[PDB]
Amino acid sequence: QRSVAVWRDGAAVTVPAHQPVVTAFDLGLGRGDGIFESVAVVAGRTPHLAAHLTRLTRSAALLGLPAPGDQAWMEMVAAVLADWPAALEGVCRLFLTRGLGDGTPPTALALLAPVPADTLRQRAEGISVATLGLGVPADFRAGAPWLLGGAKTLSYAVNMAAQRHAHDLGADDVVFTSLEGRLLEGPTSTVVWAAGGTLHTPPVETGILPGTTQARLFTAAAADGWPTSVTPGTVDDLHAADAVWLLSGVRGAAVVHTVDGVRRGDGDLSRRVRELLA
Amino acid sequence: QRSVAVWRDGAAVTVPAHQPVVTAFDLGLGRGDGIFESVAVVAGRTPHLAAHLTRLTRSAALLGLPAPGDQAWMEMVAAVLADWPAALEGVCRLFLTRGLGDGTPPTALALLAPVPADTLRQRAEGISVATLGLGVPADFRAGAPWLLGGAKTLSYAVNMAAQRHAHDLGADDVVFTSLEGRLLEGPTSTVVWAAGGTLHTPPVETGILPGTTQARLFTAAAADGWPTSVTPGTVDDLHAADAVWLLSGVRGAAVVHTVDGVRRGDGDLSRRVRELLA
Ligand SMILES: Cc1ncc(COP(=O)(O)O)c(/C=N/Nc2ccccc2)c1O
Ligand SMILES: Cc1ncc(COP(=O)(O)O)c(/C=N/Nc2ccccc2)c1O
C-alpha cells in the first residue's frame, strides 16, 4: 500500500494514493522546480527525520523556495504514518514545489510506499556500480550556484538516465566522476571506501549533497576510533580500496562488489560499518 | 484562462485547469522523468504543430518513453483549443511522463495558457542576456547520452535557477557556455547572430536542442539568398556581431540588445529575420 498527505489551509490532509494531487501547471511537474527528501520508515518510526528536515531546509534555501517549517512536515509525516504497518520498512518522500509560481503558495506533499524488495536485496547482497562522467571539473560547481550542486531537486531526469545506462551495461548503480576523474557521488548515494585503516568520502566543496547516512557513519566511526577523512579520490582509489560502499537514506549501506566490471572484496569491513550505522 | 486535457482510455478528456491531474507517485513530478514540447497557438491555430511533434518523438526516444503517437497529441491539442479565443496568443505544452513506472502507462497531458505580456514585450522590445557556464566541454555530451543533451525534459530546475541568477544580475535571459567558452544555447532558446553577411548558430553536436524557430529561419534565409552557417562561436562572437537574437517557439525572435551588461545594436537586421520567420 501507499499513502499521501497534502498541506491544505495549514493542515495535513490524507488522500487516497491513486488520487491526483497536482494540477498541470504545478512547476514541480512541468519544470522539476522543487525539492525532496526521502525519510526511512522503520518499525512505524522515522529515526532520522530531524536530519532530513535540516537538509530539506537547505535545499529549499538553494532554490529560494518558501518552506512550511518543521512543525508542518512532522504533521504530514504523522498523517501518512497513521495506518502504516510497523513490519513494513517504508520510504516517506517529502516534496516541495514552487507551485503555480512564487507569489502563490508552494505545494507540499508527503508520500509513503514500501521500500522495494530489490532495494532490500541490494542492502543484503551488495551492488555492481558503473562510473559515469558528469563532464564538470571537480572545482566548477562551487563557482556556479545555478547548477544547484548541493540541492536535492525534483529534476532527476539525468540521475534516472544514468541509472538506466548503468542497468543496460549490467550494473546496479552509478558513481559520477568529474572531468579529471575525481569521485563525486551517486545519482542517489554517497560513496565511501576503506583504505590504509581510514574511512574516506569525497569532498562536497565539489558541489555534491551532504549525505546523512554518511555523516552518521563518520560520527560513529570517529567515536569508535576508526579514522575518517575527506579524500579527493578517483576510480583508482575505488579499485585499490579494502572496501567500497554506497550510502543512502533508503537503501542504507550497500557494499560495492563490482566497479566497472572489476570484482572486489570488502576485507570483512562491512560488519563494523553496519554495527556503527545501527 | 487556461485549459487542460488528459489522455484517458485512448481519448482526450477536458478537465478544469485548477483540477489535480497527476498523483504523488508520477515520476514526472517526483523525478522530472518525462519530456515536453511548447506549441504556439496563434489565431486559434497551431501553425508549427507537426514540427514540435517530430521533436517530442525524438525527446521521448532519448528517454525511452513510450509515446502515444501524432493522432493522440493532435486530439489533445484539439481538446484544449476547443474554447480558446482566436485573439489570445497561447502556449500549448504537451507533457509525457514515465507515469508510475515503465510497465504501467505513461501520463500524457496538454495544457494551454496565454503567452504572458512580459514575453510579448520581450518579442517587441528585445532582451538583456547573461552568459553562464554549464561546466561541460563543448564535445562532452556527444559521448555521454545519460546527460540527455538533445532531449527537452520535465527536469528544468537548473534552467530555472540559471534564469533567476540572471534576473538577480539585472538580465532577462541566459546563454550557456561550455568550459572553453563556446556558445551552447538558452535554458529555453537558440542563439543566432549575424556577422560578415552570414547568419550563424552554434553546432548541436555539442549536445543542445535542435530549435524549430531557428530551423525555420535558416530554411527561409537560404531561400532568400542570406548565407547560413553552423559556427562554433564564443561570447566574443556575440559582442562582435552585427546582431544577436534568442529564438524560441513561444517568445519567437527576441533581439539581444545587451550581452553581460555590454549594450549592442542590431544593424537594422531584425526586420528581415522577422519577415523570414513570418
Ligand atoms: C545526489 C545524492 N547524493 C546522496 C544521497 C545520499 O544521502 P542520504 O544518506 O541522506 O540518503 C542522495 C539521496 N537522495 N535520496 C533519494 C534520492 C532518490 C530517490 C530516493 C531517495 C542523493 O540523491
Ligand atoms: C534548451 C532549449 N533550447 C532551445 C529551444 C529553442 O526551440 P524552439 O524554437 O523549438 O522553441 C528551447 C525551448 N524549449 N521550449 C520551452 C522551454 C521552456 C518553457 C517553454 C517552452 C529549449 O528549451
Author numbering:
A (entry chain A), B (entry chain A): 4 to 281
Q: What did the study's authors say about this model?
A:
Here, we analyze the structure–function relationships in a non-canonical D-amino acid transaminase from Blastococcus saxobsidens, which is active towards D-amino acids and primary (R)-amines. The catalytic unit of a TA is a homodimer with two active sites at the dimer interface, containing PLP covalently bound to the catalytic lysine. The organization of the functional dimer of BlasaTA is typical of PLP fold type IV TAs.
A detailed study of the enzyme includes a kinetic analysis of its substrate scope and a structural analysis of the holoenzyme and its complex with phenylhydrazine—a reversible inhibitor and analogue of (R)-1-phenylethylamine—a benchmark substrate of (R)-selective amine transaminases. In the complex, the electron density in the active site corresponds to the mixture of the adduct of PLP and phenylhydrazine, mimicking the external aldimine, and an apoform of BlasaTA with equal occupancies. In the structure of the complex with phenylhydrazine, the linkage between phenylhydrazine and PLP is clearly observed in the electron density map, with a dihedral angle C3-C4-C4α-N of about 40°. The pyridine ring of the cofactor is tilted by 12° around the N1-C6 bond from its position in the holoenzyme. The released ε-NH2 group of K155 forms a hydrogen bond with the N4′ atom of the adduct. Notably, the accommodation of the phenyl ring in the O-pocket is accompanied by the formation of stacking interactions with the side chain of F39 and the removal of the side chains of residues R96 and R34* from the active site. The orientation of the D105* and D121 residues is slightly changed, resulting in the shortening of the distance between the oxygen atoms of γ-carboxylate groups from 12.3 Å in the holoenzyme to 11.00 Å in the complex. The RMSD for the Cα atoms between the subunits of the holoenzyme and the complex did not exceed 0.2 Å, indicating no gross structural changes upon substrate binding. The reaction between the PLP form of BlasaTA and phenylhydrazine was limited to the formation of the external aldimine (transimination step), whose accumulation was observed at 370 nm.
